[PDB]
Structures are given as C-alpha cells and as structure tokens.
Design a protein around this ligand. Sequence first.
Ligand SMILES: CC(C)=CCC/C(C)=C/CC/C(C)=C/CC/C(C)=C/CC/C(C)=C/CC/C(C)=C/CC/C(C)=C/CC/C(C)=C/CC/C(C)=C/CC1=C(C)C(=O)c2ccccc2C1=O
Ligand SMILES: CC(C)=CCC/C(C)=C\CC/C(C)=C/CC/C(C)=C/CC/C(C)=C/CC/C(C)=C/CC/C(C)=C/CC/C(C)=C/CC/C(C)=C\CC1=C(C)C(=O)c2ccccc2C1=O
Ligand SMILES: CCCCCCCCCCCCCCCC(=O)O[C@H](COC(=O)CCCCCCC[C@@H](C)CCCCCCCCC)COP(=O)(O)O[C@H]1[C@H](O)[C@H](O)[C@H](O)[C@@H](O)[C@@H]1O
Ligand SMILES: CCCCCCCCCCCCCCCC(=O)O[C@H](COC(=O)CCCCCCC[C@@H](C)CCCCCCCCC)COP(=O)(O)O[C@H]1[C@H](O)[C@H](O)[C@H](O)[C@@H](O)[C@@H]1O
Ligand SMILES: CCCCCCCCCCCCCCCC(=O)O[C@H](COC(=O)CCCCCCC[C@@H](C)CCCCCCCCC)COP(=O)(O)O[C@H]1[C@H](O)[C@H](O)[C@H](O)[C@@H](O)[C@@H]1O
Ligand code: HEC
Ligand code: FES
Lengths: 216, 216, 109, 53, 160, 223
Amino acid sequence: CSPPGETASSEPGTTPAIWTGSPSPAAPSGEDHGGGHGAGAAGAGETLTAELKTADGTSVATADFQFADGFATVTIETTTPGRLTPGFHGVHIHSVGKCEANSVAPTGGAPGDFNSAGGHFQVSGHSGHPASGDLSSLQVRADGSGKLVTTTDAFTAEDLLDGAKTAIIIHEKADNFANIPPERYQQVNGAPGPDQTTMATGDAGSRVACGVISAG
Amino acid sequence: CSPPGETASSEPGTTPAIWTGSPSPAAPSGEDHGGGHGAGAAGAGETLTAELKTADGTSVATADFQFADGFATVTIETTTPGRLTPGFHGVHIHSVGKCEANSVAPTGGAPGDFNSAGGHFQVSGHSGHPASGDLSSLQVRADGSGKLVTTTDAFTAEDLLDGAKTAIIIHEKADNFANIPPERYQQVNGAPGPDQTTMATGDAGSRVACGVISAG
Amino acid sequence: MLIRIKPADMHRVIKRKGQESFNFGELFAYTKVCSHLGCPSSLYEQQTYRILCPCHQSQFDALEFAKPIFGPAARALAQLPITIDEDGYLVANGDFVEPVGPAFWERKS
Amino acid sequence: LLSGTGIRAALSGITMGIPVIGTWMHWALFGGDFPGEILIPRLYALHILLIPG
Amino acid sequence: LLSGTGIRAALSGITMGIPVIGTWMHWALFGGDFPGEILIPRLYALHILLIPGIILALIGAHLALVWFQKHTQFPGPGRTETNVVGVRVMPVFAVKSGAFFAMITGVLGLMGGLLTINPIWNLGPYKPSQVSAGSQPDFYMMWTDGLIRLWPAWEFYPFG
Amino acid sequence: QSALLRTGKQLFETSCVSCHGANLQGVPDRGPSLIGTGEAAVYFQVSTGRMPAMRGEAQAPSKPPHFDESQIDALGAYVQANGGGPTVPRDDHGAVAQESLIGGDVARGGDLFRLNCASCHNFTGKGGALSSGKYAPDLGDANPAQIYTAMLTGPQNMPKFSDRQLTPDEKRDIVAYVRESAETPSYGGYGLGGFGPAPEGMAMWIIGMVAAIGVAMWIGSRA
Ligand SMILES: CC(C)=CCC/C(C)=C/CC/C(C)=C/CC/C(C)=C/CC/C(C)=C/CC/C(C)=C/CC/C(C)=C/CC/C(C)=C/CC/C(C)=C/CC1=C(C)C(=O)c2ccccc2C1=O
Ligand SMILES: CC(C)=CCC/C(C)=C\CC/C(C)=C/CC/C(C)=C/CC/C(C)=C/CC/C(C)=C/CC/C(C)=C/CC/C(C)=C/CC/C(C)=C\CC1=C(C)C(=O)c2ccccc2C1=O
Ligand SMILES: CCCCCCCCCCCCCCCC(=O)O[C@H](COC(=O)CCCCCCC[C@@H](C)CCCCCCCCC)COP(=O)(O)O[C@H]1[C@H](O)[C@H](O)[C@H](O)[C@@H](O)[C@@H]1O
Ligand SMILES: CCCCCCCCCCCCCCCC(=O)O[C@H](COC(=O)CCCCCCC[C@@H](C)CCCCCCCCC)COP(=O)(O)O[C@H]1[C@H](O)[C@H](O)[C@H](O)[C@@H](O)[C@@H]1O
Ligand SMILES: CCCCCCCCCCCCCCCC(=O)O[C@H](COC(=O)CCCCCCC[C@@H](C)CCCCCCCCC)COP(=O)(O)O[C@H]1[C@H](O)[C@H](O)[C@H](O)[C@@H](O)[C@@H]1O
Ligand code: HEC
Ligand code: FES
C-alpha cells in the first residue's frame, strides 16, 4: 500500500519569510541583560554608543560611553581616515541631542551643528563652572584619527538619561579656557576678566562633528 | 628493621622563603596575551595605566591609555572622591613624564606640576595646532569623580613610546581655545589675534594633578 | 541533508501536501535517516537528484518530495522547513510535519 | 561505524517495525531510544556470559 | 567509596608490596597505576564469566564426585562402610531437596526485602581523598582484613 | 546584656570554676582555659551536655544537658564577654537558628562531608572509633545549630573548621546533608545501623544461617 499522504501538484507555495526567533521563555527565566551599571534613571545600562555625522551625512566619528563601576568609561573611533584635519578640535557635551546639520534653539543665527540648548550641557543642579557639559578634546594628526580619554564624571549614567537626549559636538579649536589670565591679558572693552560665552563652553568656528548620545 | 632515615632532632630549620614561581618554559609555554596593538615602537602593547598624584603625594586620578585595534581606547577614573572641585579640570599631555610636585625645564618660574618641557606634547613632525598633546576639560561635580573620553589620536602607541616618558597633567581650566574671536574680542595690546601660550596648550593656574603615562 | 537543486532542474520539482513552501528557494532539507530502518541516506546523486541509502540500496527522488523510487523504502524522507533568519543564516522554519525516523506501529495518524 | 549502522538497521529498525509490541521491545532492549546508553553493556553481557553459557 | 577503599588497601597495597614481582603484578592487574582505567572492566569479566565459570565447573565436579562416590553416613543401626542407609532419590530425597531449595530462596528473598545490604547510594563514589571509618570487607574477607590489622607492623629493608 | 552576663557568671561560678578556674583561665590538668572559645563553643558543648563533666578520660561523653536554652545563652554570653570568640548563629527573632542552617545544596554538602566529616564519623554520620578510647559520635542526635557549632569549634580531637576554611554556606550544606542522611529512611529494608559489612555479616550469620540450619534440621533426621 502507498502511504496515506503524498503528492501535491497544486498550490506551488511561497518563499519562506525571514525567520524572527522569539526570546526563550522556558530556557531563560527572565530576559537576558547585557551591560551592568547602577543606572540611577529609567535605565541605560553599561552600553551606550553614538555616531557623530557631518553636515553632508558623512560619519565624522563614532563615540561610545557607558558606566561600569560608577565611573563612565568612553572611547571614540574615527569614522573616516580624514574626518579631522591636522590640528585640534574641542568636544563639548550639548544638552540637545539633535545632531542636525544646523539648528538654533534661541532666537539668533543658527550655527552648524548648533542644536544645543545653550553651551555645555552641565548637570541640572550645576550651571557655573564647566561641568560635564564639556568633554575631552580630539587632536587629529596627518593620520586623521581619534582615540583618547579623560576623567569627566560630573554626570553619570543616571544624569545621562535627562529630559532631552544629549550629544557630543566637536568643533575645530584647541583647549585653552581663557589661558591669558587677567594679570597680563585684557578683554576687548579693557576688562581683565574672561568672556562668559567662552567660559560657558568650548567656543570655536563652525562645528565639525555632532553625535547624539542617546544610544545612537 | 626500621626505616633507615628518621629522627633528625638537630638543625631546627628556617622559615621557608616566599615562593617566586618561575615562568613556564617551552614545555608549558602557553601564557596569557598581554595585549595586541600596532606597537610602532620598541613595544608597549595594549595595556598601560598611570596614576596622576597631587603635590601632597596622594593619588588624584588614575588614567589608562592603550591601543586596542589601532586606536587608543583609554579611560580615566578619579582615585579619590574629592580630588577635583566642582568644575572642569583641563587635561593635557606633557612631553616630560616626570610628575614632580614642581619643576621648570626652562630657565624661569617653576609652576606646580609644571615638569612639562613646553605646552602640549604634540607629535614629532607636528608642532602647530593643539595635537595629541592638547586635551579638553573633564568635569568633576560635587560628587568629585572623573570618567569620560573623547577621540584624540594624533599620535599612537608608537608616538607615546617616544624618547622621553609623557604624562597626563590636569590643570584647573576648561577647553575654549580663544573662544572670543578676533572679530569682536581684543587682546591686551589691542591685536585681535590670540595668545600663543594659550593656543599651544591649555594654560591655567597651578596644576591640579600630574601622572606619568610610562605604565605608572 | 541540505541539497541545492540546480535552477535549471527546479522546474522538475514536485512538492508534497503541506510541504510546498518548505523549500527556501532552491534549498531542500531532507532528513538523512532512511525511512526504512533508519540508516542515513547520505549517498546524494546530483544530475539524477537521487538520495540513495547504503544500508539496503533505496533511492529517494529528491526532485519530487523525497519519495522512494527504488529499494525497500516505502515512505518519503521527512522534509525540514527551512528559511533564513536575520543575518542571512539558514534556520529551520518549523519542525517535521511527520515523524522523521523509520516507521513504526503508531504512525500515519 | 559499520557495526553501529548494522545494529541501527537490523536491531532498531526491525524491532520498531513489529506491529503490536515493536516499539516496546525496542525500548526494553535499548532502555530508551536507539542510542540508549546501556546497549553495548547489555550486548557485552549477552555475548560473553549469557549466550556463550 | 567503601569497596574502592577496600580495593586500594588489599588489591593495590598487598600486591605492590610483594618483594620480587609486587609492582609488576600490580601494574599488570591494573593496566598501570592503581586507578587504571581497566580495573573494573577486568573485575567484571572475572566476576561474571571467568571465576563463576570455574566455580560452576568445580561445583559440577564436586556434585559428580559426591554422586558417584556414594555419600558417606554416620554410624548407625544398619549403616556400615559398604552400604548407604537413607532414602531413594525419586520419592523423598528429590522432593525434600526441592522444598529446601524453595525455602532457602525464600529466606534469601525475605532478607533482600527486609534487611538493607550495601547502600551504595549512602556510600558516595570512590575518590582517593575520601574515606569512612568502617572500611571493612564482606565477612568472608574480614579475616584477611583482620590479619592485616593485627599483624605488628614488621617491615624489613634489605640492601636498598 | 548586663543581666545575661550576670546569670552566666552565677552559673559559671557554681558549675565549672573547679575545672575552668574563675576568670575563665583553665585549671592546669583539669580543664582548658575558655578565653577565646566563644559563645558557639559554649552553646555546642553545654547543649550536648558534655561540659558538666564528671571524669577525666579519653573523651568527654555526651549526656543530657544540665542547662536550658536560656541558661546556655547566659553561659555563652559570659564566656564570649570574658574571652571573645566565635558566636552561635541566630535567626531573625534571636533564637538559635535551626532551619536557617539547612544549606540548599545537598550534593555539595555530601561531598564536603565525605572529604572532611566521613573521614572519621561515617559515610552517613554514624559514629567512628579513634586512637585511645576516643570516638566520633553518631550525628543523628545533633540539631543543625549543634552541627554548625561543632564544625565552628573543634570540640575534642576534632579539627576546628573556621568560617574561612568552611564558609558558612559550606557548613550549612554540610548541616543539610547531616540532617538529611540522619532523617532519611533506609531504602531496601532495615539498614542494620549504618555500617555495611559488619552488621550485614552478623545478620546473615544470625538470621539467614540460623533459618537455613533450622530448616535443614527440620527436613533431615538427626543421627
Ligand atoms: C579484636 C577483638 C575481638 C577485640 C575485643 C573486642 C570485643 C569483641 C569485645 C567484646 C564485646 C563485648 C561482649 C562488650 C560488652 C562488655 C564486655 C566485654 C562484657 C563482658 C563479656 C562477658 C564475659 C559477658 C558474660 C557472658 C557473655 C560472653 C556475654 C557476651 C555479650 C555479647 C555482646 C554477645 C553477642 C556478641 C556480639 C554482638 C559482639 C559484637 C560483635 C559484632 C561484630 C556485632 C555486629 C553489629 C554491630 C556492631 C551494629 O552496630 C549493628 C547495628 C544494627 C543491627 C545489627 C548490628 C550488628 O549486627
Ligand atoms: C524482582 C526479581 C527479579 C525477583 C526474582 C529474583 C531473581 C533474579 C531470581 C530468583 C527467582 C526464582 C526463579 C526463584 C525460585 C528458584 C527455584 C528454581 C526454586 C525451585 C524450588 C521449588 C519451586 C520447589 C517447589 C516444591 C516442590 C514440588 C519440589 C519438588 C520438585 C522440584 C522443584 C525439585 C527440584 C530438585 C532440584 C533442587 C534440582 C537442582 C538441580 C542441581 C543444580 C543439582 C541437583 C543436585 C542436588 C539438588 C543435591 O542436593 C546433590 C547432592 C549430592 C550430590 C549431587 C547433588 C545434585 O546433583
Ligand atoms: C519486551 C517488550 C514485550 C512487550 C510487552 C509490552 C507490550 C505492551 C503493549 C500494550 C501497551 C498499550 C499499547 C500502546 C501503543 C499501541 O500499540 O497502540 C495502540 C494500538 O491499538 C490499536 O488500535 C490496534 C488495532 C487496530 C488495527 C488492526 C491491526 C491488526 C494488525 C496488528 C495485524 C498485523 C500483525 C502481524 C504481526 C507480525 C509480527 C512480526 C514478526 C493504540 O494506541 P494507544 O494504546 O492509545 O497508545 C498511544 C499511542 O498509540 C500513541 O501513539 C501515543 O501518542 C500515546 O498516546 C500512547 O498512549
Ligand atoms: C603478572 C606479573 C608477574 C611478574 C612477571 C614480571 C616480573 C619481572 C621481574 C624482573 C624485572 C626486572 C626487575 C625490575 C625491578 C626490581 O625488582 O629491582 C631489582 C631487584 O634486584 C635486586 O637487587 C634484589 C636482590 C637483593 C636483595 C636480597 C633480597 C631477598 C628478598 C627478595 C627475600 C624476600 C622474598 C620473600 C617473598 C615473599 C612473597 C610474598 C607472598 C633491581 O632494580 P632494577 O632491575 O635495576 O630496576 C630498576 C628499579 O629498581 C628502579 O627502582 C627504577 O628506577 C628503574 O631504574 C628500574 O629499572
Ligand atoms: C528476621 C528478619 C527481619 C529483619 C529485621 C527487619 C526489620 C524491619 C524494620 C521496618 C522497616 C525498616 C525501617 C527502616 C528505618 C531504620 O533504619 O530503623 C531504625 C532503627 O534503628 C535501630 O536503632 C534499631 C532498632 C531495633 C530493632 C531492629 C533490630 C533487628 C536486628 C537485631 C537484626 C539483625 C540481627 C543482628 C543480631 C545481633 C546479635 C549478634 C550476636 C529506626 O529509626 P532510628 O532508630 O531513628 O534510626 C537512627 C537514625 O534516625 C539516626 O539518624 C542514625 O544516626 C542512627 O542512630 C539510626 O539508628
Ligand atoms: C576525627 C576528626 C573529625 C572530623 C574531621 C570531624 N569530626 Fe565531628 N566529631 C569528632 C569527634 C572526636 C567528636 C566528639 C567531640 C566531643 O564529644 O567533645 C565530634 C563531634 C561531632 C558532632 C556532635 C554530635 C553530638 O551528638 O554530640 C557532630 C554533629 C559532628 N562531629 C559532625 C561533624 C561535622 C559537621 C564535621 C565537618 C567535616 C565533622 N564532624 C568532622 C571527630 C571529627
Ligand atoms: S536502511 Fe535505508 S533503505 Fe533500508
């Protein structure tokens, strides 16, 4: 005898859909978690990346910062061999995470990659000295690469998940912060003090790179 | 009969010395890798730490710099909970690695933790803009901790392995780099240009911390 | 056994009921275990598309659903539903619609 | 490989084939599915002590 | 644990202490050092086929000898050195021997049920580092073990 | 506690100053000094009853306790205050912990028991013999606190297992194994004690062999 079920001339069939497996409820009691951190907020974890793009959509760089044991470890890799010219660049933390080509939160000229809602994205309770709103610099040689670290922890994983997504914006200046003290140097109006705009955050020409730190 | 060798009352003995195990020879030649890196010099590897201490002999920060996949993946953590005040400490890379309390390489005033042989330790072929020697402001809030990184790779492990050991020195300034442009701001002498001392490297008051990056 | 049917010969394929969409394009996954006494049927012959079993010399026509066209076997080899997941790796799109090993009393129901 | 495939064919297949008690005989002999972890010890006993006796 | 400790004591130590060939017998029995990977398979062969086969052959010889060298008897009224006074095999002896076999196997089954023997689950797996305080063999080897215990630690050390 | 210390002192002064001299220093050749023994040692020893000891012999035997839990705690607190040392575990309320000392893992507890405890006690915590009149007692009477404190303070000719040597988790696992092996019913019949060869051989020779010989005497004819 022939087996009861055989042969199907009609119903040609269809191409199988792309498989989308489901997380294991049986094997895993809960949901597997990756990076571990205190995360004193809605939850960010010990894994946070970001891609800083250019005005034309090119990837200027790729940053990544995450908390491990209460101190945020970070690192940035150059996205292109010649993203930065043979000089220096100043990286600052901007409260507004929109890494747009050009935007202006206040009523005024919209600088390139100037979506920040002010200067350095300081802490909520800190608005004086240069708090975590200022990041480490990016010095590019003829090679044109970026890899270096500092110790900037005025904000933590908890503060990172603020009301609005933050960003890292790199302009093309060095790191001085009114290095000309009032004893010798003088201002435009004759006062020996520094400039408020310069002290608030690293101010330079048109922004070179900008990347949202909301797990971009 | 009884065993030939027994009962040595004399020669009370001595306390065994601390065991110093020899490395496994070609037989068990297997050993853990110390870190892969380009190492364009005598050899540094993908592992290098350092402790930035204060003038009182106490550790302030603990930096770590090492190439991972051709770019330095660095990280810095504050070694004390009250090292940096509520503000931005300006980091920089000094060519001279001696993290002395106060020294002056040239003939002049010896600033605290001023052992650097100049401003920012740029590359050998680069001495203009703020190359990898320069660094921006890392912020420590009322918590007093520092952990945040950037992309500053004008140099590499080969460049770090230079003739003289380098150091990471944190002064008490932010990163602006003449944020007041010549269009509006003016200097002491009336020239709209910036200061060479401020442009070469981040100039500030007395240095806060300094640590040799020669695997300190 | 995952076999790649030639595109030219893809037009000779005859599919089983409930197994028409099992193949992923020109990839067909058939159990190696022979439907008769369960030896692997590893001897795949291309340009004939015949999966031969060495234990008792039974051929299964891979082009058609892997039905035995010679030898002691009388039931077709179970066809695994296959597809590609994310990243393009081959994954099973389900389970065999029939018991896959050699037949036994409590079968075909 | 040879003897194992021979066992798989003859013993396992023809035992499972038997209509009313085939699968039960297979499970009793192999203590489970075909590659049950008692098959060769059982055959060793049968072959060195029981059948030779 | 218990039986492996017994093996380590007797089979290993006694065998390996024998002067001229002790270590050679030990290594040839164990296929090398004491925990050699063939000891239990070798003992399994010896215990299911080899030694029981010899025991069966010798029991056959024993019973055949008793059968054809008629069973001896105690002195009695009609019992002499040239006769066997008793009961014939068929009616009485056979039935009573079968009944005795039934009763003996009943005693053995009752004791297998009601009395616990060798709780290996309690006795963990053999590990050279582990041991108990009992460390005894079955009652038939208990006399050898007792000889080991009692003998007063007399060791001789010839030239090297 | 002040009153607890006072009660411990009063019990000590009329119980043991003859052999653990007042000031807790030991009487030379009658008893050791109790400085550093701790509360755990006092709890285990007095609760097992060994300490109201009325002879110097190979080993101090167990016996009914001479003090109730409150007096045991008083004596332990007094000794701990005087010397300072290991403390008996306690539960949330404050009573000596019994169920909290049952470690979750029993296979690990059994492995540790065999490596460390069975060395002298038994495979399953029955007793064992020692050099000269000493013996490791059966553990089936000991309660979890008693087992834990026995490990914590080597009572007598028993190695002292510190928390570093056997983390309290390991001791809890060992306690779980001890209680489980003690309270577990013998599968397969009456476990004749816990010693296999000797009780099994005696039971053979007495139960099976007398049955066989009596049946043979019934079947056969004396002559
Ligand atoms: C090397 C060696 C034999 C050294 C000497 C050790 C030894 C056997 C000493 C004797 C043991 C005894 C009898 C101790 C009691 C104290 C003593 C010596 C009293 C004086 C003896 C005397 C002259 C008494 C007057 C009349 C008399 C002879 C009475 C003897 C009394 C007894 C105990 C008789 C029966 C013999 C007996 C049970 C001896 C112990 C031997 C063994 C191996 C018991 C086995 C056994 C054990 C050990 C269990 O734990 C167990 C647990 C659960 C179920 C079953 C059993 C079991 O069967
Ligand atoms: C969970 C589980 C597996 C449980 C089972 C446990 C297990 C694995 C095995 C045990 C199970 C079994 C099968 C138990 C029963 C064993 C068995 C065969 C018992 C038989 C006893 C019985 C049922 C008697 C019924 C009462 C009755 C009517 C008796 C008269 C008729 C019978 C049965 C006669 C038998 C005669 C008999 C014992 C023959 C034995 C044959 C042999 C090996 C030798 C004969 C023989 C004998 C017996 C001598 O005494 C002798 C003395 C001197 C010289 C020579 C001889 C000699 O040759
Ligand atoms: C050492 C081991 C020795 C053996 C001892 C142990 C043997 C125990 C066997 C009895 C156990 C119960 C049988 C279980 C299994 C069973 O047998 O199937 C039954 C079958 O009854 C029927 O209707 C069949 C009759 C109707 C058809 C008429 C056929 C006539 C044939 C037999 C003539 C040819 C005979 C030729 C002989 C050739 C001999 C060759 C040498 C129906 O299924 P069921 O009882 O509900 O069991 C469910 C599973 O079917 C279900 O797949 C599963 O999912 C479970 O749910 C399970 O519970
Ligand atoms: C299933 C297996 C059955 C056995 C078959 C196989 C047996 C083969 C045995 C022969 C093989 C060669 C022996 C090797 C081993 C050997 O036996 O040792 C020799 C010993 O010759 C001597 O001088 C001894 C005589 C001088 C003292 C006088 C003593 C009298 C005594 C014996 C009286 C008591 C007897 C009582 C009997 C009680 C019986 C108990 C029931 C000297 O050493 P050597 O041959 O150089 O071997 C070196 C190793 O010693 C070395 O430790 C190693 O490092 C290697 O270098 C190795 O090559
Ligand atoms: C004739 C065929 C019949 C054979 C006897 C079969 C008896 C079956 C009994 C019922 C089924 C099995 C019960 C198994 C449950 C069970 O095991 O039974 C123990 C009891 O145990 C004892 O004390 C013994 C009590 C006395 C009665 C039994 C005595 C029978 C002996 C005499 C038979 C052998 C013959 C030897 C002859 C001797 C004379 C030689 C000249 C009871 O618990 P326990 O008492 O608390 O055990 C303590 C753990 O708790 C605790 O941790 C642990 O540490 C221990 O202390 C443990 O004892
Ligand atoms: C021979 C070394 C030795 C080892 C190792 C040892 N014990 Fe003991 N144990 C003894 C001795 C001896 C005593 C009796 C102390 C006394 O009576 O003062 C004892 C007492 C005890 C008691 C008290 C029982 C009672 O009822 O009084 C328990 C429970 C116990 N041991 C369990 C253990 C545990 C748990 C371990 C952990 C591995 C262990 N033993 C390891 C020898 C040992
Ligand atoms: S075993 Fe494959 S056809 Fe028979």
